[PDB]
RNA sequence: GAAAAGUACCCCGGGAGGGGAGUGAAAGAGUACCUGAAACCGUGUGCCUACAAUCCGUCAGAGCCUCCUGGGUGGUGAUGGCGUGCCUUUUGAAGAAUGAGCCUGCGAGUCAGGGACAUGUCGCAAGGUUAACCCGUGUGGGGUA
RNA sequence: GGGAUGAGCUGUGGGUAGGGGUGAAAGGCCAAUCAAACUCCGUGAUAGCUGGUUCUCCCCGAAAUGCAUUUAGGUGCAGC
RNA sequence: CGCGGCACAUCCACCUUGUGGUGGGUGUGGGUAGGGGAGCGUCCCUCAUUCAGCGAAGCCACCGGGUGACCGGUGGUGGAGGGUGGGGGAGUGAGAAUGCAGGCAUGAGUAGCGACAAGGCAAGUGAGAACCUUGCCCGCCGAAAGACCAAGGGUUCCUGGGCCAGGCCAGUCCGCCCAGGGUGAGUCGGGACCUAAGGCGAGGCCGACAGGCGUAGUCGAUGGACAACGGGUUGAUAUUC
Ligand SMILES: [Mg+2]
Ligand SMILES: [Mg+2]
Ligand SMILES: [Mg+2]
Ligand SMILES: [Mg+2]
Ligand SMILES: [Mg+2]
Ligand SMILES: [Mg+2]
Ligand SMILES: [Mg+2]
Ligand SMILES: [Mg+2]
Ligand SMILES: [Mg+2]
Ligand SMILES: [Mg+2]
Ligand SMILES: [Mg+2]
Ligand SMILES: [Mg+2]
Ligand SMILES: [Mg+2]
Ligand SMILES: [Mg+2]
Ligand SMILES: [Mg+2]
Ligand SMILES: [Mg+2]
Ligand SMILES: [Mg+2]
Ligand SMILES: [Mg+2]
Ligand SMILES: [Mg+2]
Ligand SMILES: [Mg+2]
Ligand SMILES: [Mg+2]
Ligand SMILES: [Mg+2]
């Protein structure tokens with residue numbers, strides 16, 4: 001099956017605006033005396049210093 | 055109304071739509087917060103955009119001489135650059151068209167309380 | 168003939184069927200060579 | 212060409228009107244000359260002078276006033292000698 | 302760009318790219334470069350919009366917003382009515398007949414001939430006109446076949 | 447799945463050329479094209495057929511009938 | 527019907543009573559094919575005139591205007607040509623031709639990312655590593671998924687660099703990009719030896735011409751003849767050094 005007609009701007013945008021990135025939950029951590037912000041699931045690794053902070 | 059700095063990353067090799075997907079997470083936040091979200095966003099476009107905000111913040115602090123801590127990405131937007139054109143062979147002798155889309159990413163940060 | 172394409176290269180047969188000396192052996196061939204010179208083809 | 216290297220010329224058109232100058236080198240193919248002090252170009256380090264079109268300079272007379280020049284024959288060699296107008300010297 | 306004067310130096314960046322400086326009349330000319338339209342893609346913003354069936358407009362019309370002096374612009378448009386795309390081709394198409402995704406550019410009664418007919422107009426007029434050709438820097442003057 | 451010492455398969459080199467070739471014959475094949483290849487040229491072939499033919503306004507404004515027609519979805523003349 | 531604007535045809539009265547204007551009547555003004563009439567806009571030329579680096583064209587916005595095509599003004603942008611009028615001439619107007627070229631949408635961040643051998647960990651390099659390097663485990667082919675030659679390709683080989691294109695992801699890697707280097711023969715495979723099919727073919731025969739065929743001859747390997755083995759070595763050649 002092929003598109004019968006081109007979508008209007010409105011219909012294309014209504015669908016397309018729903019393609020967005022999932023926001024990551026971020027929490028504050030303090031390792032080595034300095035503050036940083038990391039995803040919550042990576043807090044354990046952040047405290048063990050296993051997270052390259054860039 | 056607020057002192058500001060601009061950075062542009064021109065002809066960056068990411069689709070404008072994917073760049074927009076990753077900048078909609080950081081539009082309007084502080085520079086430090088935006089850099090953290092982009093650090094932790096799995097989307098590959100987060101890299102280039104992150105260094106665009108970093109460059110804008112650096113311009114603000116070095117050329118503008120203003121405080122990095124009070125700095126917010128006021129307006130970030132990705133528009134389309136030139137698109138390269140490639141041919142991908144398909145079945146039965148058809149040749150389809152691939153588009154290498156590039157982006158121009160503009161960031162304006164301003165300093166404000 | 169499954170899978171075998173029409174052009175099987177062989178430079179000696181290319182030269183003996185389409186080569187310059189083959190062209191020059193007939194008036195039609197010389198006409199072709201002069202026509203390609205006149206058009207300005209690099210390859211004659 | 213009628214403007215050679217050694218002779219001094221006066222700029223008659225451009226930014227530096229009335230600029231006395233001496234031709235460092237002539238480019239007859241491009242019809243330009245390099246003149247001392249003319250269109251001082253501030254080049255970024257890592258300030259020099261850029262060539263000026265020969266139409267914009269007139270050869271000085273070595274007797275003051277600028278001039279157009281023509282030629283005559285010296286009768287000794289048969290060579291055509293560059294000479295001035297306004298009493299047609301040198 | 303008139304001229305490479307083609308952006309030294311500093312800063313972010315692995316680079317790309319950019320910012321500040323600097324050159325330039327101009328960088329609203331930065332070797333992706335004159336002018337820089339449209340399609341198309343964002344970002345910001347004013348109004349509307351999540352109980353409504355919409356050829357997408359039109360007329361009526363509140364309310365907001367904006368800019369000027371209750372009034373008038375400009376934007377929007379709750380709500381009411383009316384309202385079956387364009388082209389081709391058909392007796393008849395909104396048609397579920399054809400063609401068109403969009404924009405920009407291009408794409409179709411032209412020219413020749415003392416041709417033919419008819420007309421408008423102008424010159425000369427019982428006449429009119431030359432053709433080849435000849436002579437002239439020409440578009441002018443000759444040239445009666 | 448069929449043949450697989452044979453009317454076998456296959457390499458290399460060669461020959462047959464377009465009303466011609468070749469065909470254990472299917473109008474098969476002759477460079478992904480074959481009831482007559484391909485290219486260039488005649489050539490801007492021709493098509494009573496289909497499509498298209500671009501700015502404006504003002505005035506008037508049809509026909510889809512007759513006759514004839516290798517004619518009937520064309521055309522001539524008439525009618526309008 | 528009322529009030530106002532326009533137009534066409536026709537009539538009547540004044541003004542050089544037809545080139546016709548003015549006023550007033552009267553009638554008329556849906557329209558496809560089609561006929562007739564009158565105009566708008568673009569470009570070029572000529573003549574005159576007038577703007578233009580104190581800013582032309584083109585483009586954009588806004589405000590105005592005309593019965594229409596359309597027009598003007600102002601501002602922005604821009605950087606060298608325009609405006610008006612009498613004429614002259616058109617490659618003079620597009621929305622449609624499954625029209626042509628280019629750019630860009632829609633589908634859509636969708637399908638797909640090319641065999642059903644299968645990857646993993648540690649370490650390294652690096653800005654960046656699922657994919658590159660090293661080691662080790664695991665698995666797969668093994669009448670090939672191994673090693674070679676011919677044809678074909680043409681430098682893809684090696685070294686050192688590179689990493690925005692390419693590689694169906696990424697890439698620090700690469701058959702990609704760049705530079706330099708690299709192929710050594712009396713014996714190998716060919717020629718300088720031989721001929722097959724077939725090709726060309728002195729003269730020749732035949733044919734209006736074009737040309738066809740062919741003798742002598744001369745080519746033409748896929749065949750005949752012909753003298754090398756083993757080992758070592760380079761980053762890259764080796765029956766060649
Ligand atoms: Mg194929
Ligand atoms: Mg001059
Ligand atoms: Mg700069
Ligand atoms: Mg600047
Ligand atoms: Mg300056
Ligand atoms: Mg300018
Ligand atoms: Mg461009
Ligand atoms: Mg430009
Ligand atoms: Mg509601
Ligand atoms: Mg209903
Ligand atoms: Mg309505
Ligand atoms: Mg009809
Ligand atoms: Mg029908
Ligand atoms: Mg339809
Ligand atoms: Mg429909
Ligand atoms: Mg039909
Ligand atoms: Mg269609
Ligand atoms: Mg079997
Ligand atoms: Mg059996
Ligand atoms: Mg068997
Ligand atoms: Mg049959
Ligand atoms: Mg075939």
Ligand SMILES: [Mg+2]
Nearest residue numbers: 464465481482
């Ligand atoms: Mg035939």
Ligand SMILES: [Mg+2]
Nearest residue numbers: 488489490491
């Ligand atoms: Mg003909």
Ligand SMILES: [Mg+2]
Nearest residue numbers: 506507556557
């Ligand atoms: Mg009528």
Ligand SMILES: [Mg+2]
Nearest residue numbers: 521522523524
């Ligand atoms: Mg008729």
Ligand SMILES: [Mg+2]
Nearest residue numbers: 505555556557
């Ligand atoms: Mg009418």
Ligand SMILES: [Mg+2]
Nearest residue numbers: 554555556557
């Ligand atoms: Mg009426």
Ligand SMILES: [Mg+2]
Nearest residue numbers: 507558559560
């Ligand atoms: Mg009509």
Ligand SMILES: [Mg+2]
Nearest residue numbers: 326579581605
């Ligand atoms: Mg100026």
Ligand SMILES: [Mg+2]
Nearest residue numbers: 581602603604
């Ligand atoms: Mg200006």
Ligand SMILES: [Mg+2]
Nearest residue numbers: 569583607608
């Ligand atoms: Mg023009």
Ligand SMILES: [Mg+2]
Nearest residue numbers: 588597598599
């Ligand atoms: Mg206008």
Ligand SMILES: [Mg+2]
Nearest residue numbers: 599600601602
């Ligand atoms: Mg203007």
Ligand SMILES: [Mg+2]
Nearest residue numbers: 583584603604
């Ligand atoms: Mg202008």
Ligand SMILES: [Mg+2]
Nearest residue numbers: 568583608609
């Ligand atoms: Mg004009």
Ligand SMILES: [Mg+2]
Nearest residue numbers: 572611612613
């Ligand atoms: Mg004129």
Ligand SMILES: [Mg+2]
Nearest residue numbers: 613614615616
């Ligand atoms: Mg005209």
